[PDB]
Structure 1
Amino acid sequence: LHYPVTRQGEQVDHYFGQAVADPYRWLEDDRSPETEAWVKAQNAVTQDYLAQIPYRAAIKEKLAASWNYAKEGAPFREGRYHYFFKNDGLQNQNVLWRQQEGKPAEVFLDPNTLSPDGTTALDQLSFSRDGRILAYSLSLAGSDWREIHLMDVESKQPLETPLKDVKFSGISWLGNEGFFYSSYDKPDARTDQHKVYFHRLGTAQEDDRLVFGAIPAQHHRYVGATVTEDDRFLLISAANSTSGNRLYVKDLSQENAPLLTVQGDLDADVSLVDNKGSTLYLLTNRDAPNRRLVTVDAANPGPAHWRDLIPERQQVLTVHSGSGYLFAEYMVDATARVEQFDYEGKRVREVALPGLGSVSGFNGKHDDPALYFGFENYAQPPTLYRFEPKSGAISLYRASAAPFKPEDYVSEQRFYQSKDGTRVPLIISYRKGLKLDGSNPTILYGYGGFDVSLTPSFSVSVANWLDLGGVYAVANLRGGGEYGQAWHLAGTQQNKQNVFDDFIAAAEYLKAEGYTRTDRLAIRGGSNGGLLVGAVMTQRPDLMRVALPAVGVLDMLRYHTFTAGTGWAYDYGTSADSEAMFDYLKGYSPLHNVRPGVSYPSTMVTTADHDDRVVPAHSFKFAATLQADNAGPHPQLIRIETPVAKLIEQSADIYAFTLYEMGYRELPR
């Protein structure tokens, strides 16, 4: 290869008396003319290399033809119609369709047609209790401001002039009288005092009644209002940030009832699930990190009176309700489990999900005859199922339109042992009919940090890899959130090496189990995941054939001084914290661990040319260093992105490069 020249400067940094040379310091300025010229030169070399791959065009063609496909959401009843969202695969915004008694479905509301480039988007939507009036909020380009439109459902015409100055607001109806919404400014100078207002249908917005937030004792940056399904209770949440909220309740069945305090401090998150009679069902993390579902009477709702209905477990709880049942959703070993409970807290059954993956749904009204839920995983595209609450019977409602036969793919979950004996989850997916003969082209992916949990999700790009004979393995490394705070912290600061060891052990396991072998293995990750790849490839360049670090944090001694670098500090620590933190960071920092004379695997570093999340500086200096130091015959390339078309192109280049570096002269067979 003919890499562009990368100038080496004389910058030298000092940490606790230790000097560290930074020859590519100038590449940290991604907008300088010199750096922009280098970016152009590097892309020219990468593109010329990729242009030599025989099957790149074929791979791109398959990706392009399978990328867009129609999608459909679950149907929901409002009045005498059933509504459901749909997207033809090309539309930028989902379309709301409607279908009655015995007629064909019709388009009801198409947000795309609301503007030229369709930069007017549909945000919140809420039907009056009788389903005859629809209130919906619309946004602009970026603007957080909203307008709430009111439509007569039967005629599809505007009922009143739209409400203006709405922001960070829900829409919740009180019967068919009107609805509650939030705004920083009186109807008729701006402040950060969010208020709840009630708009009564048939009146002007200027006459909307203030419900909460105006007096000093109610001043909060964010307030929300929800009316229970039976129109009995108004619940007002009030908060200053995403952490913790106060909550108040008002009994609408009583005349001029006062607000009672459900939670008067910001020490925990608490939200309304539903009510049964005067009993409130609340989901909270108060004294319960993994959350619990409690009940309390609305007449004396304080925390001291909350009683557990569904106690906190070792797994984080999410609650849904519908058809007179409560559904407790848990993430068990990174995948979904759903339990059906009655409102008295008695477990009815564990829902028989279609396998291990991710779910959505189980939301319905009290009287819904059936509930719908979505399911997907690495091997199965989004599919809708119908659930009969009484019997627990499940039936396929809508198969995916994605051009992939689900029965042709399989996914299994394994558990392997890391260096220190820790058991780690590993989900492996591939086309049915694979042989554990160690020859399968495999991509091992991981993240490992910031309490992020890697849960299964369908991706057209990954499905294309599987169709090529590839294996896709995802490891739930420490540092993530798969098993609570301990799993996370065990992958932070001076414990970061645990994450890398976990990933290294994942690669060894896949080989030992017969899935793949060194020259058929590629490792991939993005951001904290780019760091993962960069660290593992510099510690064990012998472990894999291909390395794919995307938008990685790679200079661990200076990441905190760059744009947005401070946010990564809780997990990593900085070179300025102490000499011990400095020494630990320098011990694994990918940039500082690349060594002259080492033979590195084939590498394709990827990054955009300008990025305020993870500055390009990381990838630029890392690629320059690999090109300067690599002694072996494998190419060290960087692909700098300067749209589905672009996503398709990126996936094609990566898979083409990966197969080509594995020695394939034609597509796998």
Structure 2
Amino acid sequence: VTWAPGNYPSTRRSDHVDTYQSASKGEVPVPDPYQWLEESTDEVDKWTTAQADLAQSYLDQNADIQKLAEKFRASRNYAKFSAPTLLDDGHWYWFYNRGLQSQSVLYRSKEPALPDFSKGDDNVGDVFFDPNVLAADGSAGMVLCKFSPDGKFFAYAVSHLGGDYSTIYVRSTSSPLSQASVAQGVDGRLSDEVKWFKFSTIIWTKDSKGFLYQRYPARERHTRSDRNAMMCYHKVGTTQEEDIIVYQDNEHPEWIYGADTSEDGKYLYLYQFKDTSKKNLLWVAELDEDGVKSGIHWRKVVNEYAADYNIITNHGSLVYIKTNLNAPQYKVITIDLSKDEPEIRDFIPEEKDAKLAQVNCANEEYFVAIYKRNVKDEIYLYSKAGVQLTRLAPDFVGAASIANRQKQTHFFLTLSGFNTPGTIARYDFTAPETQRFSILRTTKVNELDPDDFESTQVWYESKDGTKIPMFIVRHKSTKFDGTAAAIQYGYGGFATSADPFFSPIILTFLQTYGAIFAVPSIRGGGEFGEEWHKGGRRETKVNTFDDFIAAAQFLVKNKYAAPGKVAINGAANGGLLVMGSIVRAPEGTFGAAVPEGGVADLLKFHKFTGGQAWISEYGNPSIPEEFDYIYPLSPVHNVRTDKVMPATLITVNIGDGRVVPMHSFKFIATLQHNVPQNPHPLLIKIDKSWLGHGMGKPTDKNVKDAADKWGFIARALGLELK
């Protein structure tokens, strides 16, 4: 009912001890007094209720949270839309959100012509597929979808609250799903029901008769682990009992699979992955009149784990592939399958100082390429002969992506950044030269003016001398004079790049309080290719934390931010980053900390759900040499009694299947035990709605959770509303 120092809920300490092997020390007994917080019991429910009530009572003292909620709701209340796609029926299809809807709605053009979108989405299109009505009570979400190549069918993956897998349904594209259609008649879908779908997409064959998908074994209620994956094929207009097993491997039950089909109908491709590193196998089958069947003959083109290989397209037996083989910034190769021993050659060579992030074939023979140089995307068009023809959108600063179908005479680019809400560009091959590139739509926001904000990139030095760039965003009236507060974000792993992105919530906060936003490109990410990742993983993981701490220290030292006013935030691996940073950094480096759904027990992560796959990133705690570098880094095992911690709000969702909430529960119990008299509050907020696989929360709930996180940060850094 009321927070003060030393007023935390009583938390039983058990006598559980685990024994590990260390290469340098031999046997190490490790106490785990909060092992019981791994479980789901009455005692755990009482403990979570008491923590969550303590956190809510503290937030209730802060009258600025309700004001932030109103500011944030308004900042998100503007229409949003995707790039459109032309199907073989001659009509264009795009997603549209009115502003605050929980799931966006798939629209279809009224006429078979590219709409003039300035007239408004409802005047040029009608509803084709509204995912909000999948269940009457809103408890069902569409996680992904794919139209067939001929445009006649629409496949869609659905999750429900409480569920660990998705289910694929199929419907005719002339049978829409709307409020009106559900009130007036039957659903209008086929009886097809493809269950146990996970960690996959939907890959149609070019004859439009069916699709490939990954599934797991059927499981009765009476544990939580996904093994023995199967790549399968489902024929449209049949039931799942008739689905074909395309590939599985009982000798390697942890491996998983992906697939692709070539545009000309000639090839089926199989990808295999052994863990979360960027290494895959690649096998190739030739299709014929018999289609997809059991006993497919596989040519094992890549059959050892060594590099990342992803198919772009083919012309006859020449196959174009994006790879990092001997090329950590990536490149394009060709593999010629007409030879018995395939001949491998560079098509677009590796750029030493820019990462090849994406390549698509457009208008049958051209290639569109996105390079990421200094964490900023650049777009180029190439000929069939591999000649760089031109740069597109040369003044754009941010992140970019391509949307097209190989056979068509246009493509789109979707562009966004720290002050670019969402621009959709079109390139039309049939128009005159000099009139091919144009802007289809621009996203207009609410209350905010993106021109009021300056985004720059600066460089700092890490502990070992390494030079690291960092994005900084401010409202233009804020000075770098040692007085502003800073919010610093990070992820730090798995070769994921911390790219620019647009958030109306972040910019609203910066303008409200005169704070700055900082995004350092720390090692472990993929900003500078595979060597950047290698610089912060397994035995070099410590560098990720050193880089993040040095960024915060640089902000204060060079007067971007005031001493003691740097707050840090991150999610999942980003939560690990925040929790490890508060433990390792000197006292007073940070003024607030918010880890969301984070990893924290680095000795037991591999014992739960899909954690085994992350041995690629963190190492294996049961190998003696690797224990020696993991143990000194595990946040749960390195909390001390003698360092003041900053104000901390841990957040978790109770149904999280990817990162079990165990991790956060153990960290917060350990904090409260070790520094019970800490002058700043150490709290955990626990959401008890059990989210289904791949589902988000409702919009209204996301607005409220954002007001709580940002209001907590504001108060901890001593910021007031004017």
Closer, same or farther in 2 for the Cα pair 1:62/1:106, shift >3 Å?
same
Match of 2:687 among 638, 641, 647: 641
Closer, same or farther in 2 for the Cα pair 1:25/1:125, shift >3 Å?
closer
Amino acid aligned to 2:685 = R
What SS does the corresponding residue of 1:318 show, helix, strand or coil? strand
Task: Give the aligned partner of residue 126 of structure 2.
Answer: 107
Are positions 1:569 and 2:615 aligned together? yes
Task: Give the aligned partner of residue 341 of structure 1.
Answer: 382
Match of 2:79 among 64, 70, 76: 70
Closer, same or farther in 2 for the Cα pair 1:173/1:486, shift >3 Å?
closer
How far off is 1:81 after superposition?
Answer: 4.0
Amino acid aligned to 2:312 = V
**Higher gyration radius (CA):** 1
How far off is 1:503 after superposition?
Answer: 0.8
Are positions 1:425 and 2:469 aligned together? yes
Task: Give the aligned partner of residue 268 of structure 2.
Answer: 236
Note if contact 2:356-2:369 (Cα within 8 Å) is conserved in structure 1. Answer: no
What SS does the corresponding residue of 1:137 show, helix, strand or coil? strand
What SS does the corresponding residue of 1:652 show, helix, strand or coil? helix
Closer, same or farther in 2 for the Cα pair 1:537/1:182, shift >3 Å?
closer
Listed as ranges, the matches of 1:353-432 within 5 Å are 353-368=394-409, 370-387=410-427, 390-391=433-434, 394-403=437-446, 404-432=448-476
Task: Give the aligned partner of residue 526 of structure 1.
Answer: 571
Note if contact 2:671-2:682 (Cα within 8 Å) is conserved in structure 1. Answer: yes
Amino acid aligned to 1:318 = Q
What SS does the corresponding residue of 1:63 show, helix, strand or coil? helix
Match of 2:533 among 456, 474, 488: 488
Amino acid aligned to 1:137 = A
How far off is 1:418 after superposition?
Answer: 0.4
Task: Give the aligned partner of residue 350 of structure 1.
Answer: 391
Task: Give the aligned partner of residue 614 of structure 1.
Answer: 659
Distance 1:92 1:386 in 2: 26
Amino acid aligned to 1:109 = F
Alignment: residue pair count = 631
Note if contact 1:379-1:429 (Cα within 8 Å) is conserved in structure 2. Answer: no
Are positions 1:292 and 2:331 aligned together? yes
Listed as ranges, the matches of 1:165-176 within 5 Å are 169-174=202-207
Task: Give the aligned partner of residue 541 of structure 1.
Answer: 587
Distance 1:161 1:32 in 2: 41
Task: Give the aligned partner of residue 256 of structure 1.
Answer: none
CA-based RMSD of the aligned residues comes to 4.1
Closer, same or farther in 2 for the Cα pair 1:87/1:594, shift >3 Å?
same
Distance 1:113 1:558 in 2: 38
Amino acid aligned to 2:106 = V
Closer, same or farther in 2 for the Cα pair 1:212/1:437, shift >3 Å?
same
How far off is 1:449 after superposition?
Answer: 2.1
Amino acid aligned to 1:379 = N
How far off is 1:632 after superposition?
Answer: 4.5
Q: 1:437-479: CA deviations, max 9, x gaps?
A: 1222211111222222222222343233233233111112112
Distance 1:587 1:7 in 2: 25
How far off is 1:649 after superposition?
Answer: 2.1
Distance 2:74 2:313 in 1: 45
Distance 1:467 1:44 in 2: 31
Amino acid aligned to 2:103 = N
In structure 2, runs of 5+ residues without a counterpart are: 21-25, 117-122, 216-227, 250-254, 275-279, 290-295, 689-696
Amino acid aligned to 1:308 = D
Task: Give the aligned partner of residue 219 of structure 2.
Answer: none
Amino acid aligned to 1:105 = V
Are positions 1:88 and 2:98 aligned together? yes
What SS does the corresponding residue of 1:660 show, helix, strand or coil? helix
Task: Give the aligned partner of residue 41 of structure 1.
Answer: 50
How far off is 1:25 after superposition?
Answer: 4.0
How far off is 1:424 after superposition?
Answer: 1.3
Are positions 1:318 and 2:358 aligned together? yes
Note if contact 1:111-1:120 (Cα within 8 Å) is conserved in structure 2. Answer: no
Listed as ranges, the matches of 1:171-320 within 5 Å are 171-174=204-207, 179=209, 181-182=211-212, 226=261, 228=263, 232-239=264-271, 243-249=280-286, 264-267=301-304, 272-275=311-314, 280-284=319-323, 290-295=329-334, 300=338, 304-314=342-352, 315-320=355-360
What SS does the corresponding residue of 2:543 show, helix, strand or coil? helix
Closer, same or farther in 2 for the Cα pair 1:269/1:526, shift >3 Å?
closer
Task: Give the aligned partner of residue 255 of structure 1.
Answer: none
Task: Give the aligned partner of residue 153 of structure 2.
Answer: 135
What SS does the corresponding residue of 2:51 show, helix, strand or coil? helix
Closer, same or farther in 2 for the Cα pair 1:85/1:653, shift >3 Å?
closer
Q: 1:137-168: CA deviations, max 9, x gaps?
A: 244546655454444699x999x995847786
Note if contact 2:175-2:189 (Cα within 8 Å) is conserved in structure 1. Answer: no
How far off is 1:620 after superposition?
Answer: 2.4
Distance 1:196 1:613 in 2: 26
Task: Give the aligned partner of residue 457 of structure 1.
Answer: 501
Closer, same or farther in 2 for the Cα pair 1:355/1:113, shift >3 Å?
closer
Are positions 1:32 and 2:87 aligned together? no
How far off is 1:516 after superposition?
Answer: 0.5
Closer, same or farther in 2 for the Cα pair 1:504/1:305, shift >3 Å?
same
What SS does the corresponding residue of 1:588 show, helix, strand or coil? coil
How far off is 1:345 after superposition?
Answer: 0.8
Closer, same or farther in 2 for the Cα pair 1:541/1:30, shift >3 Å?
farther
Task: Give the aligned partner of residue 692 of structure 2.
Answer: none
In structure 1, runs of 5+ residues without a counterpart are: 186-190, 253-258
Note if contact 2:266-2:288 (Cα within 8 Å) is conserved in structure 1. Answer: yes
Are positions 1:446 and 2:479 aligned together? no
How far off is 1:60 after superposition?
Answer: 1.2
TM-score normalised per structure 1: 0.82
What SS does the corresponding residue of 2:342 show, helix, strand or coil? helix
Closer, same or farther in 2 for the Cα pair 1:260/1:30, shift >3 Å?
closer
How far off is 1:54 after superposition?
Answer: 2.5
Distance 2:146 2:157 in 1: 10
Distance 2:670 2:545 in 1: 21
Closer, same or farther in 2 for the Cα pair 1:398/1:302, shift >3 Å?
farther
What SS does the corresponding residue of 1:518 show, helix, strand or coil? coil
* More displaced 10-residue stretch of structure 1: 91-100 or 373-382: 91-100
Listed as ranges, the matches of 1:588-603 within 5 Å are 588-603=633-648
